[PDB]
Amino acid sequence: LPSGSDPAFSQPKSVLDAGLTCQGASPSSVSKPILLVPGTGTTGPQSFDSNWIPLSTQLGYTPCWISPPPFMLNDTQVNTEYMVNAITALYAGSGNNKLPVLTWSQGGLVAQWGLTFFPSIRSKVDRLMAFAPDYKGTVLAGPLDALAVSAPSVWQQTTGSALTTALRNAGGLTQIVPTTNLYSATDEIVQPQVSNSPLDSSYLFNGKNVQAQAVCGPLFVIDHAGSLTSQFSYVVGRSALRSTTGQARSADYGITDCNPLPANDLTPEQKVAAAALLAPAAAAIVAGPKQNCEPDLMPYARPFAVGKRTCSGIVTP
Numbered sequence: 001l002p003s004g005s006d007p008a009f010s011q012p013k014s015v016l017d018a019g020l021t022c023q024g025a026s027p028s029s030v031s032k033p034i035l036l037v038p039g040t041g042t043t044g045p046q047s048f049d050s051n052w053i054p055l056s057t058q059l060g061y062t063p064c065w066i067s068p069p070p071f072m073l074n075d076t077q078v079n080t081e082y083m084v085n086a087i088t089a090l091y092a093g094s095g096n097n098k099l100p101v102l103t104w105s106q107g108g109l110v111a112q113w114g115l116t117f118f119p120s121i122r123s124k125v126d127r128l129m130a131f132a133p134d135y136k137g138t139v140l141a142g143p144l145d146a147l148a149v150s151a152p153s154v155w156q157q158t159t160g161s162a163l164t165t166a167l168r169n170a171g172g173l174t175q176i177v178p179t180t181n182l183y184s185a186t187d188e189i190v191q192p193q194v195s196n197s198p199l200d201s202s203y204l205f206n207g208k209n210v211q212a213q214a215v216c217g218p219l220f221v222i223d224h225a226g227s228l229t230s231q232f233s234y235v236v237g238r239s240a241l242r243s244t245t246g247q248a249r250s251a252d253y254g255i256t257d258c259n260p261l262p263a264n265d266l267t268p269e270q271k272v273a274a275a276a277l278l279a280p281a282a283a284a285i286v287a288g289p290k291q292n293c294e295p296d297l298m299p300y301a302r303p304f305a306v307g308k309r310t311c312s313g314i315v316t317p
């Protein structure tokens, strides 16, 4: 696992700061903050306004989020810069205290990539609660890449990409901080996710890997968005955030929590918005940037993906 100093940011600090927002407070003076990292094709509010923003507030936290432009569709390595910057700011802004990070979809890959290549935030992140993370990417993006209808981050989130290869070779498939990964075998966006083993894309060694069906049975069905918004997900998430070990505890949930519908504590308005969470993301992808090659790895990641090919050619140290 990489150690020492953090790589330099490619983006100006002012640009990175502009992508960070907290509810009812400034990052420089915030009480009990939680960092929310959005999924592909969305902004912070679009991913969590109908779910974990009001839910985390009820848990006593001040929700903060990043919204890397455009709609998390650009280079994952740059999206990670926004998170690394946000963690540094919130840590100091909360009185030099560790803070929890809650993510969805790409947000999980971004978090784990940051913990792997930016050693300084490792002592600043209390725990990681990732919903439907794609650490090994997804095999479903392949056809889209071939037709050149994939945004930069979709290329990188494709199984076998130079970025996912770099994460694995750098030791990023093992948990770095106390991590809980909640996912579903019936995810229509991220696959493979069916084996309930290391083969799954959401699996991290030594982490608390919770495949919904392993707990609720083969008849339990929640999709990519459901993995984040369901009542089952809320119970598992609340367990992870309250746990003294930093990971969700099996003793906190059971079969009676296996409710595929949006979290019960959400208002009717929020429940409807949560059910249609994937709609805004799909529109962003249809109207967003598209290219015919995977973004080049930055200098610090190149040694871990030698032989792979990116937009400029074959990767070398």
Ligand SMILES: *[C@@H]1O[C@H](CO)[C@@H](O[C@@H]2O[C@H](CO)[C@@H](O)[C@H](O)[C@H]2NC(C)=O)[C@H](O)[C@H]1NC(C)=O
Pocket (backbone or CB within 6 Å): 010, 011, 069, 070, 074, 075, 078, 295
């Ligand atoms: C989207 O990602 C690309 C690639 O990382 C960014 O482009 C780089 O930006 C830095 C800083 O301005 C430049 O030094 C590099 O030369 C750029 N590289 C390429 C290949 O363009 C870009 O800034 C990002 N855009 C947004 C809006 O996040």
Ligand SMILES: CCCCCCCCO[C@@H]1O[C@H](CO)[C@@H](O)[C@H](O)[C@H]1O
Pocket (backbone or CB within 6 Å): 221, 222, 223, 225, 226, 227, 230, 260, 261, 262, 274, 275, 276
């Ligand atoms: C007459 C039969 C009614 C069956 C109702 C099943 C309701 C479960 O539907 C659930 O809706 C959630 C919100 O969109 C999704 O996130 C879940 O994936 C889905 O399983």
